[PDB]
Amino acid sequence: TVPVALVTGAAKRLGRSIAEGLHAEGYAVCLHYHRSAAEANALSATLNARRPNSAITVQADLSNVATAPAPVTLFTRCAELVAACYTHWGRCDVLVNNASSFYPTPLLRAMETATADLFGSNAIAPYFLIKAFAHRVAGTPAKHRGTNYSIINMVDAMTNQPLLGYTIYTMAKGALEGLTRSAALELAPLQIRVNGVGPGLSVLVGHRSKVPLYQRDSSAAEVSDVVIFLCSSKAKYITGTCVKVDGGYSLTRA
Amino acid sequence: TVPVALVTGAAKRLGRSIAEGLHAEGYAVCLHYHRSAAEANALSATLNARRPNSAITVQADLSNVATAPSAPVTLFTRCAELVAACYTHWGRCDVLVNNASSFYPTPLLRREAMETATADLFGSNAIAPYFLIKAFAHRVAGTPAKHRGTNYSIINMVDAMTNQPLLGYTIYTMAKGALEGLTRSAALELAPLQIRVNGVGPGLSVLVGHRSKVPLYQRDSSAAEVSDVVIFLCSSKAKYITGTCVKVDGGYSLTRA
Amino acid sequence: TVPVALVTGAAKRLGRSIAEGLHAEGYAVCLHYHRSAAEANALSATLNARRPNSAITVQADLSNVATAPAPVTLFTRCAELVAACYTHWGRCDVLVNNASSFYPTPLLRDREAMETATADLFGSNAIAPYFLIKAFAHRVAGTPAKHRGTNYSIINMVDAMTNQPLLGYTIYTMAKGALEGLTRSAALELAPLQIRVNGVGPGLSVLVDDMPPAVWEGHRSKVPLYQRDSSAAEVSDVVIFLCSSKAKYITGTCVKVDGGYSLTRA
Amino acid sequence: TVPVALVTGAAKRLGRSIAEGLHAEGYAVCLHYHRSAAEANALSATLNARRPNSAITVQADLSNVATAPAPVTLFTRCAELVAACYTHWGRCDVLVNNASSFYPTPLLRREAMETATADLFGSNAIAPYFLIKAFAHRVAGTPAKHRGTNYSIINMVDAMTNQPLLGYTIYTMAKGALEGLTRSAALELAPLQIRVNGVGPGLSVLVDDMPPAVWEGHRSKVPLYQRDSSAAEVSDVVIFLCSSKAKYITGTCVKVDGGYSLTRA
Ligand SMILES: NC(=O)C1=CN([C@@H]2O[C@H](COP(=O)(O)OP(=O)(O)OC[C@H]3O[C@@H](n4cnc5c(N)ncnc54)[C@H](OP(=O)(O)O)[C@@H]3O)[C@@H](O)[C@H]2O)C=CC1
Ligand SMILES: NC(=O)C1=CN([C@@H]2O[C@H](COP(=O)(O)OP(=O)(O)OC[C@H]3O[C@@H](n4cnc5c(N)ncnc54)[C@H](OP(=O)(O)O)[C@@H]3O)[C@@H](O)[C@H]2O)C=CC1
Ligand SMILES: NC(=O)C1=CN([C@@H]2O[C@H](COP(=O)(O)OP(=O)(O)OC[C@H]3O[C@@H](n4cnc5c(N)ncnc54)[C@H](OP(=O)(O)O)[C@@H]3O)[C@@H](O)[C@H]2O)C=CC1
Ligand SMILES: NC(=O)C1=CN([C@@H]2O[C@H](COP(=O)(O)OP(=O)(O)OC[C@H]3O[C@@H](n4cnc5c(N)ncnc54)[C@H](OP(=O)(O)O)[C@@H]3O)[C@@H](O)[C@H]2O)C=CC1
Ligand SMILES: O=C1C[C@H](c2ccc(O)c(O)c2)Oc2ccc(O)cc21
Ligand SMILES: O=C1C[C@H](c2ccc(O)c(O)c2)Oc2ccc(O)cc21
Ligand SMILES: O=C1C[C@H](c2ccc(O)c(O)c2)Oc2ccc(O)cc21
Ligand SMILES: O=C1C[C@H](c2ccc(O)c(O)c2)Oc2ccc(O)cc21
């Protein structure tokens, strides 16, 4: 029988690679997107042409704001993301919190949008998603649960060496790290594993020559393959961990 | 000549110990409070009686919500206003201690309650500290270099034990994680203005069971056992220290179940 | 043509499981052992049965002491372990530093004990891996570039729980700390040769039941995920993954395999 | 009556400043040295002039080798360093493991080999272990009514060893070991109220023997102050962790690095 993965920010780049890698392992994939509707749908078309009934796409803004229909809260929109898996395939085995906004929030020379957007997508939405994922599992009768529940948070290998001017983003990745550890401890009784993967420089649009390994940013596969392994039954003893995929970049000093 | 400290959640417990310790070094202290008006004002009375015009108190809800006034007033404005209060009253703000921290369960395993918890926990512990630091920094940057103080220090109160999370406290644990990130990012970016940014993480302090589990002394800390560390990190002897965290937990993070 | 793995302490438990997992991927394996000669030979028969000439065994004390021949240093014993791979199969692609001694060295209450403990605990957990990495790297550097393999990888078996020290095990915990510094230092310095160096740190894995059963049950019950120790495979599969081409951007890291044990507090 | 501090590598640089700082708080100081006899002796002269019988000097090689006789072990040499405090003043309250060897051991290219491992691992990790063990033994053997009331051990570790200096593998491993000792000793020695902490400099009193451009180069990399630290900028932190105000702190490391560890290449 066929497991289901929910992948946020799945339309392009690492999220796409993650969805493709999970698809190749036999997963049906729910492809979340925000603005990249055409890329999400083209992705879904490729994958459904490969195996019918193996991809859907769902839209949501994961910023921490109310949207239009009572206003719709982020919590609700997160619970509905997970509900789309259960509605279409009756299960949700893997969650990958990949979607992320990333832009400067300088301390030294509006703010309310940056805060909602950078914290929502990077931290608050992952928490609501993990909470909805777990409620669904706890509400499944023990005999009917899957046997390999796995949540991956995409964190950042370099946030201990902060990028100058990216405070809110760096704070939100730090919160997402605390989510990995607290969610791994609390959800262990349900056998839901929760882990982090931290890219260094991946698929850049010249820090890249500073990467000790190969002196380049990584490909998308070089990160997504790690995510796929941590979701595999071979990784069943791994929880509350964080795997850097950074080519040694976090080893460098100015 | 007299430096000024702003201490959030200053009315009781570690915040009061911190404001007392800074006061003892000669600081004037702005005592921020939320609901503890009576406790804050009693503290300010004591300090003012000891040294006239050495304490004020200022009220603010550091939850990430709008509050009642034109338009409603955002967290950002209330945070700027706290820093402004020190500049208004005393012409300076040398030290900021981000101590205010709302703490209660947010279980993942079983909502008006969760919008509230998110705003309150993610606010007091992480978002308000960010806007406070930004307002602190704006001020210094806007002060002519010749008139700047010589010892700017920001202290974030974090948690020695959040790498070993307390079961059921996810949002609070996330918010302390964000606050650790703020310490390292602000330390790097504010270094050109010589503004130092460090963390102090208590383990168990002034508990109101696990106390027996602390390797050193088998008890929680007193308030001064934490606040003395804060005061050291704000002293000129600590001027090469930035971007770092000091645990004050009597070895509790060393323990495994 | 067939890649080669050296696995120290490979006779039993996790080192055996590592050697088997690498053999299953198609590596030829040099199984190092110290006193478990019968177990190493047994395992070597099994692998050589699945696939002829794909396992050998080599004996070495990896304690930081000179042995009987002029006297033989630890360094020389480590260079010879790596040489054995090259002599027999013309290459060494993978090194797994797994061999480890582990016993109490209390700070609080014969100096023979104290002496030999330091040499044995540091040698096997830290100094031999240093020399082994040095020898592995000198060989790769000494290979004409055209003839180099395309996936060199060193795994160092660390401990997920050494930041929460086991009471009474100071020297062991210090040695594991040196071994984490070796991972980071060797990763940085060997990056130009495309040699990845990563850590795997098992928490409670194949716990020997050699005390009252309440103590074995009590230990296991503390692990958040499954309330048990791991199987050997649950660790060795991570080792295998990190040596595979799909891990080729991963270096200088440490993967904990601990069921969330390091998330706990007393 | 007067508390006693044992400082290793006390003769120059940070160890000298730690010794002076502790002395300035009223400590008697046992000044350990290996080659810098003239410096150690001058320091003891200064401290003894300031306060009679407040300093002594003791010489020991802290490399993990046996020395000139039956050979003397690094273990015995460390117990005797502790015993000198007890023989002269009857106590030892503070131990600062400051002595340190630091030089390349490249992975990529005879008695230079074996001597490097012994010297780098000895000074930075194994001698700190035997010193802590001796220090602990002496406290456990003291009747509780005669115990000091503020025992503190400080290990000098390195803020930057997680971003390893290229070519310095043995050194970086030795400091990793010493961080392990901080955490395991703090756990084990907590029942005797002996606190065990680390202080990690980044770039402190950077030595002058390179071209000025290269010296200014290194310094300019530190976010805070674009300079290396003074010796007192590190030693003040050491002294604060030894003070009774720090009595709830154990098993922790304090970085004194001007934010150098927050950088990336
Ligand atoms: N690539 C790199 O070098 C690094 C990546 N990372 C982390 O790895 C993960 C993936 O990286 P990468 O593939 O580069 O990610 P991208 O920066 O390409 O962003 C991923 C997706 O996030 C979605 N997203 C952004 N904001 C929101 C929002 N408010 N609501 C909903 N979705 C949103 C976007 O979806 P849409 O396009 O549909 O609008 C976007 O495609 C991220 O979590 C990132 O933080 C960390 C360090 C370095
Ligand atoms: N005590 C301990 O053992 C531990 C403490 N810590 C940290 O140390 C610091 C001090 O601890 P402790 O003294 O026990 O702190 P408290 O738990 O007593 O909290 C301090 C003050 O924070 C203020 N506060 C709470 N919510 C808000 C809000 N929404 N807006 C404004 N202010 C608010 C309250 O002010 P008022 O009373 O005026 O409403 C409260 O008095 C905190 O940052 C805490 O997280 C970390 C781990 C353990
Ligand atoms: N199992 C666990 O719970 C944990 C394991 N680890 C680490 O994982 C690795 C594997 O664990 P595990 O399988 O339990 O290991 P073991 O304790 O079973 O020991 C591994 C092997 O190391 C070899 N060894 C010991 N001392 C020496 C020496 N002086 N010279 C050469 N070889 C030596 C022994 O070989 P021989 O039998 O041939 O003498 C032994 O079989 C080790 O590095 C360990 O420290 C870390 C934390 C927990
Ligand atoms: N300065 C810096 O920027 C940094 C310093 N540190 C750490 O801080 C501490 C103090 O630093 P610093 O003042 O620079 O230290 P030094 O490099 O100046 O060394 C201090 C003393 O160690 C002694 N020593 C060296 N080898 C041996 C040995 N085999 N046995 C006995 N003693 C020995 C020497 O004593 P003698 O002269 O008497 O021979 C030397 O003066 C050290 O632990 C260092 O590792 C860490 C990172 C950066
Ligand atoms: O593509 C990037 C590079 C960008 C980056 C660029 C340069 C760096 O040195 C560095 O650490 C990170 O990091 C990201 C963080 C979030 C995200 O969604 C995308 C990226
Ligand atoms: O008083 C406490 C104890 C409480 C606590 C209690 C028990 C623990 O094991 C632990 O880690 C933490 O932590 C706090 C966190 C924030 C705060 O504002 C107050 C406290
Ligand atoms: O087999 C074990 C379990 C043992 C162990 C692991 C975790 C514990 O809490 C504990 O009490 C004991 O740790 C080891 C360390 C090194 C080693 O080579 C083997 C082991
Ligand atoms: O003097 C130094 C500076 C030196 C140093 C520190 C930071 C650097 O970037 C660098 O290149 C060199 O580190 C040391 C380590 C041990 C020691 O005993 C002394 C020193």
Q: Which atom of ligand 2 is nearest to the CA of B60?
A: 31
Task: Check if the beta carbon of residue D222 is closer than 8 Å to that of residue D203.
Answer: yes
Token digits of residue A109: 């020379």
Q: d(Cα A25, Cα A189) in Å, to the nearest integer?
A: 26
Dihedral sign computed on CA atoms, order B222, B225, B229, B235: positive
List residues of C whose CB lies inside 8 A of any A CB. Answer: 184, 187-188, 191-192, 194, 196, 224-226, 230-231, 234-235, 237-238, 241, 246-253, 255-260, 262-264
Task: Check if the beta carbon of residue D124 is closer than 8 Å to that of residue D178.
Answer: yes
Question: Is residue D152 marked as binding?
Answer: yes
**Best of D107, D115, D139 to disrupt the C interface by mutation (most C CBs within 10 Å)?**
D107
CB atoms closer than 10 angstroms to residue C186 = 29
**Torsion (CA) D71, D77, D80, D85 in degrees, nearest 10:** 160
User: Which resolution in angstroms does this entry have?
Assistant: 2.1
Dihedral sign computed on CA atoms, order B195, D224, B239, B205: positive
Strands A55-59 and A94-97: unpaired
Q: Which domain holds residue D241?
A: 1-265
Q: d(Cα D63, Cα D118) in Å, to the nearest integer?
A: 5
Q: Which of A119, A131, A178 sits opposite B176 (nearest CB)?
A: A178
Q: d(Cα A137, Cα A127) in Å, to the nearest integer?
A: 15
Task: Check if the beta carbon of residue A126 is closer than 8 Å to that of residue A78.
Answer: no
Among A107, A129, A160, A139, CA closest to A5: A129
Please report, for the domain that includes residue A186, its CATH number: 3.40.50.720
CB atoms closer than 10 angstroms to residue C167 = 17
What is the DSSP code string of B85-109? HHHHHHS---EEEE-------B-S-
Chain A: nearest CA to C249, how far in angstroms? 5
Of all residues in chain A, the one with the smallest CA distance to C265 is: A185
Task: Check if the beta carbon of residue A55 is closer than 8 Å to that of residue A31.
Answer: yes
B214 Cβ closer than 6 Å to some ligand 2 atom: no
* 3-state secondary structure at position C196: strand
Q: Which of C231, C238, C249 sits opposite A238 (nearest CB)?
A: C238
Report CB contact under 8 Å: A182, B190: no
Helix boundaries (H) for A140-219: 167-187
Strands A4-7 and A28-33: parallel
Q: d(Cα D190, Cα D214) in Å, to the nearest integer?
A: 45
Q: Distance between terminal CA atoms of chain B?
A: 51
Query: D62: Cβ–Cβ under 8 A, 6 or more apart, which residues?
Result: D8, D34, D74, D77, D78, D99, D122, D123, D127
Token digits of residue C4: 């080669």
Q: d(Cα A24, Cα A47) in Å, to the nearest integer?
A: 9
Sheet holding B95-98, edge to edge: B55-59, B28-33, B4-7, B95-98, B152-157, B195-202, B245-248
Among A235, A178, A179, A173, CA closest to A200: A173
Ligand 4: residues within 6 Å at CB? D 9, 11-15, 33-36, 61-63, 98-102, 119, 122-123, 156, 158, 201, 203-205
CB atoms closer than 10 angstroms to residue B175 = 32
Specify the experimental method: X-ray
Task: Check if the beta carbon of residue C151 is closer than 8 Å to that of residue C248.
Answer: yes
Report CB contact under 8 Å: B141, A108: yes
Query: D229: Cβ–Cβ under 8 A, 6 or more apart, which residues?
Result: B240, D201, D202, D203, D204, D205, D256, D257, D258
Of all residues in chain A, the one with the smallest CA distance to D222 is: A254
Chain C: nearest CA to B164, how far in angstroms? 4
Q: d(Cα C4, Cα C2) in Å, to the nearest integer?
A: 7
Ligand 4 centroid – CA C211 distance (Å)? 45
Task: Check if the beta carbon of residue C235 is closer than 8 Å to that of residue A237.
Answer: yes
φ and ψ at residue B36, rounded to 5 degrees: -90, 55
Report CB contact under 8 Å: B257, C262: no
Task: Check if the beta carbon of residue A19 is closer than 8 Å to that of residue A31.
Answer: yes
**DSSP state, D257?**
S
φ and ψ at residue A147, rounded to 5 degrees: -115, 10
Query: B28: Cβ–Cβ under 8 A, 6 or more apart, which residues?
Result: B2, B3, B4, B5, B53, B54, B55, B90
Report CB contact under 8 Å: C253, A244: yes
Q: Buried b vs exposed e over C197-211: b needs ≥16 C-beta within 10 Å?
A: bbbbbbbbbbeeeee
Task: Check if the beta carbon of residue D15 is closer than 8 Å to that of residue D9.
Answer: yes
* 3-state secondary structure at position C216: helix
- ∠ CA C224-B204-B136, nearest 5°, is 110
Chain D: nearest CA to B159, how far in angstroms? 13
- Name the amino acid, one letter, at A14: L
Q: Which of C191, C224, C256 sits opposite A248 (nearest CB)?
A: C191
φ and ψ at residue D30, rounded to 5 degrees: -95, 115
Report CB contact under 8 Å: A243, C252: no
Residue A30 burial by Cβ neighbours in a 10 Å radius (0-12, 13-18, 19+): buried
What is the DSSP code string of D3-51? -EEEETT-SSHHHHHHHHHHHHTT-EEEEEESS-HHHHHHHHHHHHHHS
Q: d(Cα C105, Cα C125) in Å, to the nearest integer?
A: 15
Q: d(Cα B186, Cα B98) in Å, to the nearest integer?
A: 13
Ligand 5 centroid – CA A201 distance (Å)? 6
D101 Cβ closer than 6 Å to some ligand 8 atom: no
- Name the amino acid, one letter, at C134: K
Residue D143 burial by Cβ neighbours in a 10 Å radius (0-12, 13-18, 19+): exposed
Q: Distance between terminal CA atoms of chain D?
A: 51
Question: How far, in Å, are A5, A96, A248, B254, C150 from residue A130 at the CA level?
Answer: 13, 10, 30, 29, 39
Task: Check if the beta carbon of residue B177 is closer than 8 Å to that of residue B159.
Answer: no
Question: How far, in Å, are A173, B231, C168, D236 from residue D250 at the CA level?
Answer: 29, 18, 17, 17
Q: d(Cα A176, Cα C99) in Å, to the nearest integer?
A: 36
Atom 1 of ligand 8 has which residue's CA nearest to it?
D206
- Name the amino acid, one letter, at D252: T
Task: Check if the beta carbon of residue C252 is closer than 8 Å to that of residue C188.
Answer: yes
Structural domains of chain B, count: 1
Task: Check if the beta carbon of residue B224 is closer than 8 Å to that of residue B177.
Answer: no
Among D215, D211, D258, CA closest to D233: D258
Report CB contact under 8 Å: B215, D251: yes
Q: Hunting for tokens 């002196």 — which residue is that?
A: A215
CB atoms closer than 10 angstroms to residue C242 = 25
Among D244, D203, D245, D242, CA closest to D226: D203
Chain breaks in chain C (C to N over 2.5 A) after: 69, 109
Q: Buried b vs exposed e over D36-59: b needs ≥16 C-beta within 10 Å?
A: beebbeebbeebeeeeeebbbbbe
Of all residues in chain A, the one with the smallest CA distance to D223 is: A254
**Mutational pocket test of ligand 1: of A63, A74, A100, A203, the residue with most ligand atoms within 8 Å of the beta carbon:** A100
Q: d(Cα A211, Cα C250) in Å, to the nearest integer?
A: 12
Q: Which chains touch C (3 or more CB pairs under 8 A)?
A: A, B, D
Query: B242: Cβ–Cβ under 8 A, 6 or more apart, which residues?
Result: B187, B191, B196, B197, B198, D223, D224, D258, D259
Query: A8: Cβ–Cβ under 8 A, 6 or more apart, which residues?
Result: A15, A32, A62, A81, A96, A97, A98, A99, A125, A129
B102 Cβ closer than 6 Å to some ligand 2 atom: yes
Token digits of residue C84: 């054995």
SS3 content of chain A, % helix, strand, coil (to 5): 45, 15, 35
**DSSP state, C30?**
E
Q: Which ligand is nearest to the CA of D215?
A: 8
**Best of B167, B216, B256 to disrupt the C interface by mutation (most C CBs within 10 Å)?**
B256
Q: Which atom of ligand 1 is nearest to the CA of A62?
A: 30
CB-based contacts of B24-28 (< 8 A; 24+ apart in sequence): B24/B231, B25/B231, B25/B234, B25/B235, B26/B2, B27/B2, B27/B3, B27/B54, B27/B94, B27/B95, B28/B2, B28/B3, B28/B4, B28/B53, B28/B54, B28/B55, B28/B90
Q: At what angle do helices A74-89 and A125-139 cross, to 10 degrees?
A: 40
